[PDB]
């Protein structure tokens, strides 16, 4: 096959101009959509705060308007997804992974209004979900919408434009362009066959989508952690231990979300009114925990700088962890539109710091800072649960800007993804696409 | 296929333990080899310098001891490749990519002693070539050595163990683990068909190889640039122009490297004694300029901190640039063992700084620093010539640690890879492997 090889190589990266230009337009619209989605959920979040002060008299009334304001917003999002777009529930990354293997449709005329406005209710009400979920699936569907509007065709045009929309969606959700491209390369491209996702076109759409969000958010970072200390060579063994712990917890947590999808389903059996009334109960729980104990609820980005700086007690860290594991399952396994990706960053650092605090006082000769194991654990639950370790560490590094910790972050990532494999776990997103493709057949 | 997929997805990332253990072994041996290669080249670096001190009065004698000391060392490298391992000349990256597409043999019993000891003479004599070439092909050959010693087989055992050795070789050559992995997936994987390069095994070998490089190199960085300024949004258009300049120069330089391979062959027609005596003449050439004008010669890491800080005059920058492109071709196209990758980092920074100095004095309202366009151009010729922009951008960032410049680095990198394609350029590594497989199978 050298004959085909010699001039395949002589024709490499020959992306058609039509695809890369339309990759630019896709990224532009994904960025604007992500910006509007971000500003919308923020506007609702403080509408709920401003309500809490016209009600700061009656502490019972105050816990009432907190619950119901979030319940209504939650019920709204559950309704619009079970009524107009069943595949816009949960993360949406597994559905975009199905689409890239040509095994799920991208109904952009339905999920884009549903996922946008539906996610606004779930995230604006203060549930434990990430915006990445919405923004990736929104961005993918936007990729096919302009595929269709201009009805370009070829396998690559469909696969590329759908990939760059998803990469632009992840980038804009974290201000992390490099992670957006790596996510497509490592996790969401079809993983058992060759495809011609044009990487340079994914590049273009990521650039324009990241320009669009910095037009409306510069000078402020999602998480600022400062410059932490370095990691001596004789301390690296401690990060491998931390990864081993994540490697054993990763699958265990993956089984809980999947099993909780089943347990929560039997409560409503599948009915739209019963389902939407339980989504209002979980939405009101988090709007209430949103004022009785903020660390229990919300996306969790606020607590990451606090935990890294060692400003939490070990008691509070243990409370937050088990609380946030409950709240995280109860929101994501319920089917609410919203990601699991960002909440596991919060769970990763909080356990990271706890491992850091024990290490610092078992080894005073190491002169440790708990924050360094916070940064290393941040992407560790992603590595053990999602098993996209290269995205997690480059994303964490994109958000924390402490390159001097790349070796410990790498070591804790692979220890997590090694023990997740050796304890019989599977990549969560692939396990959810599998169960989705299984019931699309068991009905025959 | 729906059924085949469902049991592919539920059976994903399950690399056999035998491969992961042997990935740990190859990375360990690649690291030790790369460190030993690095210390050797440095030991010859001052052995040759200390000779310059017992001779520093007689100015004719000293320009003599410079030429001869480097000519002999060069002749020692040209000889060892032309007589015992012809495929260990030049870079060796494309030969290692041929092996991964099952299109070239990896004769580790011959290439490991040849390129190691051959490169010592070529790089230790001060020619403008990089360690990347040797360490990746050396590292790949070690992957096949442990692939044979313990007689593992299966397509992946052959492909992964050879891939991780190559990634471990790039990582150890730049202290850039993330770039090592990105290089395999983006550029060095077979790029037109599915393959089983286990990413988790590449991870293992990369960490072990750079842990070994940090046991013998910590506290000192290859390139230290300080923290440069940020890049305002109204300045990004200037980086797009800079990429456009790199995008049209990229291919022009690619024609020169290829054409100079032809021109250099006709002087020696191909038999070993005329060839190595011409390798000694340019090997002595660069050993003389190594101190009549050091910036013209050597790997080029020396000038980059100097060029970034604007400590070069614009007259000299163009001198160094036009000198260094001359020096670069005649050393790499000669067939000497050594990479072109690192020399083009130097050329990228020298061209960036020149564009930056012009920008600083056409736009005082932008409050610019020339260094930011040095950092953005550093990886731009990599993107225009090699067309591995994601590796180039993550490698430059791993070595200079100015994350705040990610967008300008991304924009000029894509501007480079955009115009290189639209002006009829080709990925250099693919274009030379093509020409290697073309004459072997056409005029056999």
């Amino acid at each position, epitope marked *: 096959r050298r004959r085909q090889l010699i001039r395949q190589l002589l024709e490499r990266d020959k992306t058609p101009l039509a695809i890369l230009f339309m990759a630019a337009v896709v990224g532009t619209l994904v960025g604007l959509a992500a910006v509007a989605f971000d500003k919308g959920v923020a506007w609702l979040q403080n509408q709920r705060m401003g309500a809490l002060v016209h009600t700061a008299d009656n502490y019972p009334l105050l816990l009432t308007v907190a619950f119901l304001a979030s319940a209504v917003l939650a019920m709204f999002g559950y309704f619009l997804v079970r009524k107009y777009a069943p595949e816009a529930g949960g993360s949406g990354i597994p559905e975009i992974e199905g689409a890239l293997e040509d095994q799920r449709p991208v109904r952009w005329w339905r999920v884009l209004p549903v996922k946008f406005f539906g996610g606004l209710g779930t995230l604006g009400g203060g549930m434990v979900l990430g915006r990445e979920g919405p923004t990736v699936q929104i961005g993918g569907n936007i990729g096919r919408m302009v595929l269709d509007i201009f009805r370009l065709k070829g396998d690559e045009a469909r696969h590329t434009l759908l990939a760059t929309g998803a990469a632009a969606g992840l980038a804009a959700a974290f201000n992390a362009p490099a992670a957006g491209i790596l996510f497509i390369i490592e996790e969401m491209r079809p993983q058992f066959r060759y495809t011609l996702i044009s990487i340079k076109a994914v590049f273009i759409g990521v650039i324009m989508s990241t320009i669009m969000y910095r037009i409306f958010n510069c000078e402020v970072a999602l998480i600022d952690v400062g410059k932490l200390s370095d990691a001596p060579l004789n301390t690296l063994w401690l990060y491998l231990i931390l990864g081993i712990i994540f490697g054993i917890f990763g699958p265990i947590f993956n089984k809980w979300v999947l099993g909780m999808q089943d347990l929560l389903h039997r409560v409503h059996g599948g009915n739209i009114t019963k389902w939407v009334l339980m989504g209002g109960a979980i939405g009101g729980l988090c709007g209430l925990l949103g004022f009785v104990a903020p660390a229990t609820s919300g996306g969790g980005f606020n607590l990451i700088p606090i935990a890294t700086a060692g400003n939490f007690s070990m008691g509070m860290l243990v409370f937050i962890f088990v609380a946030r594991v409950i709240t995280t399952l109860l929101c994501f396994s319920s089917g609410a539109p919203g990601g699991i990706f960002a909440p596991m960053l919060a769970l990763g650092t909080v356990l990271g710091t706890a491992f850091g605090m024990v290490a610092v006082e078992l080894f005073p*000769q190491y*002169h440790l800072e708990a924050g360094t194991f916070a940064i290393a654990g941040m992407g560790a639950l992603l590595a053990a649960s999602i098993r996209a370790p290269l995205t997690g560490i480059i994303l964490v590094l994109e958000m924390t800007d402490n390159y001097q910790l790349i070796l410990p972050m790498i070591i804790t990532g692979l220890g997590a993804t090694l023990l997740a494999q050796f304890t019989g776990g599977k990549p969560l997103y692939s396990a959810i696409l599998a169960r989705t493709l299984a019931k699309q057949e068991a009905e025959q | 296929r729906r059924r085949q997929l469902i049991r592919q997805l539920l059976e994903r990332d399950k690399t056999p333990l035998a491969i992961l253990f042997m990935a740990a072994v190859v990375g360990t041996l690649v690291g030790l080899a790369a460190v030993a290669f690095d210390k050797g080249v440095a030991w010859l670096q001052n052995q040759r310098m200390g000779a310059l001190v017992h001779t520093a009065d007689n100015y004719p004698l000293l320009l003599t001891v410079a030429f001869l000391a480097s000519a002999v060392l060069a002749m020692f490298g040209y000889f060892l490749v032309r007589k015992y391992a012809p495929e260990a000349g030049g870079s060796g990256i494309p030969e290692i990519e041929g092996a991964l597409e099952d299109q070239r043999p990896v004769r580790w019993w011959r290439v490991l002693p040849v390129k190691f000891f051959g490169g010592l003479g070529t790089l230790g004599g001060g020619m403008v070539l990089g360690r990347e070439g040797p360490t990746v092909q050396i590292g790949g050959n070690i992957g096949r050595m442990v692939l044979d010693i313990f007689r593992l087989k299966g397509d992946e055992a052959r492909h992964t163990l050879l891939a991780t050795g190559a990634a471990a070789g790039l990582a150890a050559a730049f202290n850039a683990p993330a770039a090592g992995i990105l290089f395999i997936i983006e550029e060095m994987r077979p790029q037109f068909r599915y393959t089983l390069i286990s990413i988790k095994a590449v991870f293992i070998g990369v960490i072990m190889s750079t842990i070994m490089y940090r*046991i013998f190199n910590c506290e000192v960085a290859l390139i230290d640039v300080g923290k440069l300024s940020d890049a305002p949004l109204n300045t990004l258009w200037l980086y797009l122009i800079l990429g456009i300049i790199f995008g049209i120069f990229g291919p022009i330089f690619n024609k020169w490297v290829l054409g100079m391979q032809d021109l250099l062959h006709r002087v020696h027609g191909g038999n070993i004694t005329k060839w190595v005596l011409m390798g000694g003449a340019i090997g002595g050439l660069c050993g003389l300029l190594g101190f009549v004008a050091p910036a013209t010669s050597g790997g080029g890491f020396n000038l980059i901190p100097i060029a970034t800080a604007g400590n070069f005059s614009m007259g000299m920058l163009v001198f160094i640039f036009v000198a260094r492109v001359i020096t670069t071709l005649l050393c790499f196209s000669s067939g000497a063992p050594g990479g072109i990758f690192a020399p083009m980092l130097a050329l990228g920074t020298v061209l960036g700084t020149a564009f930056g100095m012009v920008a600083v004095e056409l736009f005082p309202q932008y409050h610019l620093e020339a260094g930011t366009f040095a950092i953005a151009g550093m990886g731009a010729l990599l993107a225009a010539s090699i067309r591995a922009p994601l590796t180039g951008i993550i490698l430059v960032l791993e070595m200079t640690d100015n994350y705040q410049l990610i967008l300008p680095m991304i924009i000029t990198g894509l501007g480079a890879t955009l115009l290189a394609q639209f002006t009829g350029g080709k990925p250099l590594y693919s274009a030379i492997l093509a020409r290697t497989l073309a004459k072997q199978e056409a005029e056999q």
Partner: antibody
Framework: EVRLLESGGGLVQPGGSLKLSCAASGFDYSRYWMSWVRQAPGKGLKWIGEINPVSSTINYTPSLKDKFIISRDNAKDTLYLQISKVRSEDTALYYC??????????????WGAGTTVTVSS | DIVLTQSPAIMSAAPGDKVTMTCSASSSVSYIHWYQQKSGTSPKRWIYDTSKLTSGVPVRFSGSGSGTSYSLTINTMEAEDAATYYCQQWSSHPQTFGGGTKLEILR
């Protein structure tokens, strides 16, 4: 240069207290752990304690609660050490040292000249 | 704490001759550092992590050892080598110095 200049040492009565100071120059005084170490007249070096850059962790030699108080102010570039209820055993030359490491087994990188403390009535 | 006692508290050696002092531990230690102190001057980091020399320390100096016994030597001793050498540990906490070996010129 890298320079540490200790000051504040001299003659104080038994049972009194003192406050030694160490002025750092020629390096980022933050980012570094600082440490005190004393040498009794004609004896060995003995470690007092150490302080991190952000004063979050402070360790002392095994020696009773608030006898020593190590503190820093990264703004004015100096490190401090208070000794309380001082007795004649605290008569020593007091060294201020910048900490660092190679493989990760920490050493006392750079020292100052020292100040002598004499405890006598 | 871990006690490190150094071998010859006092001793003398002629110039151009090989010296050797020893540091030994109550438990077993890792990566020992050595400091040279002349009278009137601050201690200077000399040899660290068992055998690596600080920038400036002449190559006549060298360190070695394992677990519980370590040493500094000078192949051919010079006059400027006259000082007191303290071994130091931080393998375990808290760190401890050796009693020191004074080593002066013989004539």
């Amino acid at each position: 240069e890298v320079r540490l200049l200790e000051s504040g040492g001299g003659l104080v009565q038994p049972g009194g207290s003192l406050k030694l100071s160490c002025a750092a120059s020629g390096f980022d005084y933050s980012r570094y752990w600082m440490s005190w170490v004393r040498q009794a007249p004609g004896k060995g070096l003995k470690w007092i304690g150490e302080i991190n850059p952000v004063s979050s962790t402070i360790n002392y030699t095994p020696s009773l609660k608030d006898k020593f108080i190590i503190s820093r102010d990264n703004a004015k570039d100096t490190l401090y050490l208070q000794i309380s209820k001082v007795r004649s055993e605290d008569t020593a030359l007091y060294y201020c040292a910048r900490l660092y490491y190679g493989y990760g087994y920490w050493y006392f990188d750079v020292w100052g000249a020292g100040t002598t403390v004499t405890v006598s009535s | 704490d871990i006690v490190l006692t150094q071998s010859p508290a006092i001793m003398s050696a002629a110039p151009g001759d090989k010296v050797t002092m020893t540091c030994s531990a109550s438990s077993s230690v890792s990566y020992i550092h050595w400091y040279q102190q002349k009278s009137g001057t601050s201690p200077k980091r000399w040899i660290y992590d068992t055998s690596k020399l600080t920038s400036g320390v002449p190559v006549r100096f060298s360190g070695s050892g394992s677990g519980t016994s370590y040493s500094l030597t000078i192949n051919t001793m010079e006059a400027e080598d006259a000082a007191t050498y303290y071994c130091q540990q931080w393998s375990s906490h808290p760190q401890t110095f050796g009693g020191g070996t004074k080593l002066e010129i013989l004539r």
